[PDB]
Amino acid sequence: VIGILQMICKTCCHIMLSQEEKKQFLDYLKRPGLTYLQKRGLKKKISDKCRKKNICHHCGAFNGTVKKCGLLKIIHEKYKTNKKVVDPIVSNFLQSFETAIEHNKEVEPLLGRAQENLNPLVVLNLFKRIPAEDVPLLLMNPEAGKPSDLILTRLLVPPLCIRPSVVNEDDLTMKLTEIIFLNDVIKKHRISGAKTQMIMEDWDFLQLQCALYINSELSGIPLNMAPKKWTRGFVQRLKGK
Amino acid sequence: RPEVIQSHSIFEQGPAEMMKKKGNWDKTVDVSDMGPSHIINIKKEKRETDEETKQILRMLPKDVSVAELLRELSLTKEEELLFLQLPDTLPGQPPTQDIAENACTLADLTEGQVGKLLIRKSGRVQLLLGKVTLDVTMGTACSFLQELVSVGLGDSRTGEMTVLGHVKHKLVCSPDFESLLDHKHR
Amino acid sequence: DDEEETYRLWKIRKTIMQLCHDRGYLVTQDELDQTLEEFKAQSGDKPSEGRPRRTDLTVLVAHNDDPTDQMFVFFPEEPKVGIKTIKVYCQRMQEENITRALIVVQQGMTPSAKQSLVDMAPKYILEQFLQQELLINITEHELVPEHVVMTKEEVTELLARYKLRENQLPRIQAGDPVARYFGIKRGQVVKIIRPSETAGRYITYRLVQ
Amino acid sequence: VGASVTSSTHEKKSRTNMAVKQGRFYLRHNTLSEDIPIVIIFKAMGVESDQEIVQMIGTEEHVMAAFGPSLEECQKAQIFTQMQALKYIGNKVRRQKTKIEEARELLASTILTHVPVKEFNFRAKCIYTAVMVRRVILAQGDNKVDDRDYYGNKRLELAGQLLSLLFEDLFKKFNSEMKKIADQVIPKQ
Amino acid sequence: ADFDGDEMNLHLPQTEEAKAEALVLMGTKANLVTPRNGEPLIAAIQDFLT
Amino acid sequence: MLLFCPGCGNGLIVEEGQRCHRFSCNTCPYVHNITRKVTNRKYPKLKEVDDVLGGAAAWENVDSTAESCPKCEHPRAYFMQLQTRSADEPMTTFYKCCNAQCGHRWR
Amino acid sequence: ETLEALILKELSVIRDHAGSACLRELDKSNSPLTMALCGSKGSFINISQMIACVGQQAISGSRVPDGFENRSLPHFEKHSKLPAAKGFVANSFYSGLTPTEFFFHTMAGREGLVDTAVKTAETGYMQRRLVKSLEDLCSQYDLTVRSST
Amino acid sequence: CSSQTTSNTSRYAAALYRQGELHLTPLHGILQLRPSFSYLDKADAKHREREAEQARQRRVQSYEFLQKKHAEEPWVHLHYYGLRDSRSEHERQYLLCPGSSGVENTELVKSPSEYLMMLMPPS
Amino acid sequence: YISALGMMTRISSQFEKTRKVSGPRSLQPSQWGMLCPSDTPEGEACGLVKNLALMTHITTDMEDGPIVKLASNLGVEDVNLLCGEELSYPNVFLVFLNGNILGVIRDHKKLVNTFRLMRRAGYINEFVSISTNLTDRCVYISSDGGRLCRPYIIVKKQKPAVTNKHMEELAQGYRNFEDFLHESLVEYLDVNEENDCNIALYEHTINKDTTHLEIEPFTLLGVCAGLIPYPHHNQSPRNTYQCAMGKQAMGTIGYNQRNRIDTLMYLLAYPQKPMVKTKTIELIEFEKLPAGQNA
Amino acid sequence: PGTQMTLKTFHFAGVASMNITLGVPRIKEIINASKAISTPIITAQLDKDDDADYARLVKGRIEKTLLGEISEYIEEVFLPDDCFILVKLSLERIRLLRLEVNAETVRYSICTSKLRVKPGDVAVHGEAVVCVTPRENSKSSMYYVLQFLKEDLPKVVVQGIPEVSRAVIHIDEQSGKEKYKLLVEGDNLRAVMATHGVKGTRTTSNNTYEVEKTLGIEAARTTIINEIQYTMVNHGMSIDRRHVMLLSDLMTYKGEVLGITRFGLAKMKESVLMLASFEKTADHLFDAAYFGQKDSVC
Amino acid sequence: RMTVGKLIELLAGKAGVLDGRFHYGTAFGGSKVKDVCEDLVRHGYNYLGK
Amino acid sequence: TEGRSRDGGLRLGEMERDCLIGYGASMLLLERLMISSDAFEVDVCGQCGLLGYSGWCHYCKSSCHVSSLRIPYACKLLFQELQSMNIIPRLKLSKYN
């Protein structure tokens, strides 16, 4: 996800390349006998050759670096000040926090830390517009799928035949039950119109549970909700002796 | 920078090297002893080791109690200041002080002759004190200044201070434990 | 000093000339067995000799198939070759109207010219060797079996024999010291004759990628 | 090379190290942000005199020849008083009048704890640290590393010595709950 | 093996093809020589040599 | 070798700000001009000079006398010697022989 | 090291000659001799140790290092270097070892047990990697050998 | 500045040598002196000023509390006289205690069998 | 029976097979006469599980009161009365107690001798040890418990302290072990202190210097390894395997074995006692509960 | 055979020195084909062996020699007007070493990465003594910079090719012909044969990577085979040469030497399931689905 | 295996049974083979067991 | 199963798996590791390339493109969990000529 969002123009959801270069890579991909390791090599090649471009040739839009701003948190560095001449984009962006600076005094000292943050709704609604012809350049088999299914909004649940009645019930059953429980409470509680901060904190907690539902080896969790016992994720039972 | 270099290894004149040196560092300008430039010969810096505080000139020895005291008596006859340590408790008992078994301290005895010091053949040194004797050993050496002083609190508002002299040596006393066990078996 | 450098100059001349012969360009046998004293006779002592010119050679031509195809050999002097020097070399080359040329560096060469050394022109290409490497001709080393280049017909017959597609053969890297020695381009083929533990020999083929 | 001591007593187990990463000596302990050049700790304890330091370490030519470098960096710094050194360590304090006394107490009570000190007269602790440096510097003359298999340095526990702790813990826990219940019940119920 | 109390597994294949295959390639009579260098392994042992 | 202030016991540095260089303190106005010379360094440090004259280097260091082997005594291993570590550290003499297909080199 | 080299050479000479002497004295129809000659069980070292002399014990191919300060056991003087103190053994198995020789002998023996324990894992890991890497190849009917590709 | 070394000074003694006779005096205290460096702190303070139901008591363990305790005690100023002053030789006379050369001291009656048990009391 | 008794003396290790370091597994000369040489389990635990020798002791914490009081008289000098330069001489020694610094001494030899003479007489607990270290110029004293001890006969001027008369008295029942301790005939040593002695293995090897003497060499070997007859006529692994195979023999368990109900119990119908027996077989009463039959 | 390994003793070719890796660790290091290895050894042949011509000195021309004893004494030269740093030379002793160093050579040597000390800052007053002048750099540097300038006798950075060391005795018994050789400890193959006066064509190395980089893949595989067969024979077991021939043929057929490691295996092999079967099993799947690859079963 | 410990055990046992004696095998001690041999020959078996 | 209290049957550990490859046998290791360990049969729909049940593709609502196939049970379990992670192996099959 972060690779692709660093290879995409936010303004117009286009790949940042010149037409001659685009044709050059298209010739490279035309070459017969494409091999998996060659796929990896050309993934690195395109990443390097496209990261050099800082403006969108199609619409002239300047886009910043996208960086993981926190554990399971991504931010876009578009609105970044520089040691060189101040960019017009940040000049117009920073001045828009006047009302917040007036209301709260902690805005002004960190008004420059405001950047373009990315979230599943924003991202998904950006990739749903992607032109099809860009997909092959992104090393996506269009028959295999499309970028919108890459961000998940619906989950399977494995059949009973792989989970015994007693692991009392298997961790998966507990994981699924707690996830749905959170889903019900968060929907009715947001329907209750509660405070912002803790609604999004519930969102983050939801995301965290989903991550742990796949992989039980993550160790970046803060102390005050860190797990106190070992549990088996999918990777745990697929890997190991 | 020169690249072509032809080195030499035939025996050179050592005196030529010594004379080159001489001409390079022995052109003395020490005559520049002007007002801002005097140095008091007593006012030099000092070495890391006290025993050899002689890095620039104008141009400790082993000892034993018997030898030091014999030297003191023989080669000189003026007065010296000695610092010495006694065992925690003296052989005596409190002089009608009405006592916990408080230790008999030097501070708790009357003036006058208290004992004798005896030096035996082979240089062994002992202190005779009443019915018992205490061993004496030269202490750890010292090299930094130690000054004996007397403080006079002549008044609650002010007093007077007079120096008495410096301390040169240390002495250490000890009980003769093996003698005690031999005198009183257990 | 001035004797070891002259020895180096004679040795590098000998090895480079051997390489020219091996690649099949025009060369005179009497110079192949040129002695160090002969080099002193034909070229003065180090202090009297000028590195950037004295050794420059262009006599070799592709007489093997076209005597009119001249080739040029250059020997810069500065420890790291600079852009201006290669610009002088390229203008001299254009004046001489040749395709390629060889360059011998003492210690290195500048990074901007490193980049330029791949894109001067499609019709012109340059090949750089280290003085340190050239001091010995690897072809004579005990651990290097004989390599031989062959014509397209030979590879045609070979691929016909085993019923192979060209991309199935074992590979050899382009940057390989021997590949550089032979100056072969990508897509050629090389025969190897490994000296057996006995009088026999094993033949194997490698492709240059 | 380096040296460490496991300063453990009835109250807590703590541990301090030394580093020769560059040739100059640094002191390193977990509750500070980073390791600190040793002369700074010495000054902070109150041995500011450079003479006093070098006499403490030793007089022989090679020992102080090798020790020399470990003070130049300090005179690049402006740490010429106990207060300055203590301020610096304060700035380097790490947590899970802070600038002044918190560092003083931390030094006095958590570094080489098994060495006792009462009135802030650190002299005993200075001597010990001086011994610690002299060991490590001289240890490079010959590679006589302290092998951890010498059975003089092993100690064996036993049934009683184990169960002492476990009863200790359980009794503390029992008392603390009685305490907790006492607080909750009387004032309101 | 060493007959000082060891244990050994036994398997019985359940097919005619696998029977034929085990007998031909894996039989003892066709494995007197090791593939490392071609030397004989199954030879007389102590107390027969004496 | 270190210098320290008699007035404050701290290390002394050397500087020039007048006709004559001086040792001086950076805490007290004690200064001691150096009118003469002293002869003890810090023993500085630069690494091993190995191959400055590698291979068949200059021929000026030829010599007449040489030792010989106790086994074969073929004509080519003339003497060399070298040093161990530092000014007050010792020297070591080795004997090495190299025709082919062996490993001989004596101490 | 020169002294070590000399001492070990001399001690080895001792064991060889003594053992040689015993085999001369040894009679035909002896059982260990018969078992040694035909190679069913034993070797001429073993019949020499049982009868003549147990050799210098070696730890890592070197004489027993000091365990205390400058000696192997307190039973020997400081910095002592005679053969007996550094692990040599002079009694045969027939005539029995003494307490100090027996201790040194055990020190050498345990190294074999430790080695066998350590061997277990690393060798298996190597083999597993290697067979994994190579398993695919096969010898075609054309006499070439080709990977899966 | 002076820093104290030990609380108890009983066991130590100062003795003056004389021909044929030795005189001993208990010490009232041993102290160690150091050059002061507070003037740098004063300069720093000057620069800084130019720039610009309670919980259980634990003050018993706080450094400034001892500083305050010491501050309670008033200062005294002392007149000084160097060793060159004959005043020093006048004061020296007090060292040689008068008395008969041979005196049977009343104290020190304990015999060695006793001495062992006083400096080593029963455990 | 041997299985249950052997287990009581087993020593574990905190290292608990974390990884290979070629460290603790090897036998070290510092175990002499504290831990059995042969009794160590085979397998991956080799050298991490150990057992005690037949004659051994463990110490406990002491007062620390009298020890420092005595030291304060024998000429130990207080550190804080002196500057730092004093540590550099070649004649002072640092005195440590429990790793805590105590003072500076000159002429260490006299302090050690007096201290050992004091301990033998009885004014310091026999489990306090004092040893000297020349290289670092320190003398150590320790009183913490948990360390290991052994009793050795004292030797003075090339004659043993103990004499035939004493053995007759002990045989007649006049005296007991504690008597030998008080009469300064035998005294406990540790690994740290026996580093500064010269043990004599037998009478004939006593010489000018030897200070102590072994009570019985055959007490090196632990309980389990006492079963082997002629253990010093065998190659070493053969001794090790028997220790780990006499734990499994089928024998008798105890006189209440018929009343016990237990998960698994093996008895032997007609056992018999050995015809070639160690002395340790007598000490641990093995021949009352035999575990084999004379073939 | 690796399982059969017993780690036998007296493998130091009969001199108890020259401790090179051998045994199961050695086989491991060849198979992994790590670009860096422990205890590398390079060897060379000059022209001739024994006594008194053209052979010995070259060894001293390339091995470790500190600046060190070449100065018999090192002492200060303060003088009221100013001070400088000087070094004496033990010329008579240098002729004993007979390395051709001299005042000018060292003067050429200095200023190499030495705080950009200018040639004017160094002067030669005689063949026996050279001196250097201090200066202020102002980057945490002052006139008292002298202390950091102490960069001349055993260790800062030096003239010549670094990463060389010393070799020791290795005698022979076959006296029927005169044969002797020079061993070199280090990790610079290229330069050591580039030295004037050495039979470069017959130099060799045990560093598999070094030979490949400098001579070519055919030279590489010949070293792999030599090393395995050599190592194996020293330990006493036997392996038919064809087995090792195939091991090296596979290891060196793609164009470069590839170790038998997870990285190497992932490089050669392609199957998703096979890779997931061996190692790093929990990472490839998401990638593979991302590329949407279709795999056969072969 | 060189267990000469067992070859001595058997002789000492044999010589012990024939007159009701129990023998000892103490470490670094025990009855010496020398004396046991004479005790066998007193009963008429060969003085070395065979 | 594994134990002796429970029923057992030994393991063909990976070393044996190589041994069987080594001889060059092919039905033997197939038999040992699939016929007599976890032999199992499933069905798949060739049009969508994913498993169904009872010859009825619940995804496609059809019974025409379905087929049956033999497969070790552990492999079937592997396909389920991977599908559970949305990693869908859309397998492709053809005639066995």
Ligand SMILES: [Mg+2]
């Ligand atoms: Mg077995």
Ligand SMILES: [Zn+2]
């Ligand atoms: Zn655009």
Ligand SMILES: [Zn+2]
């Ligand atoms: Zn100062």
Ligand SMILES: [Zn+2]
């Ligand atoms: Zn379907």
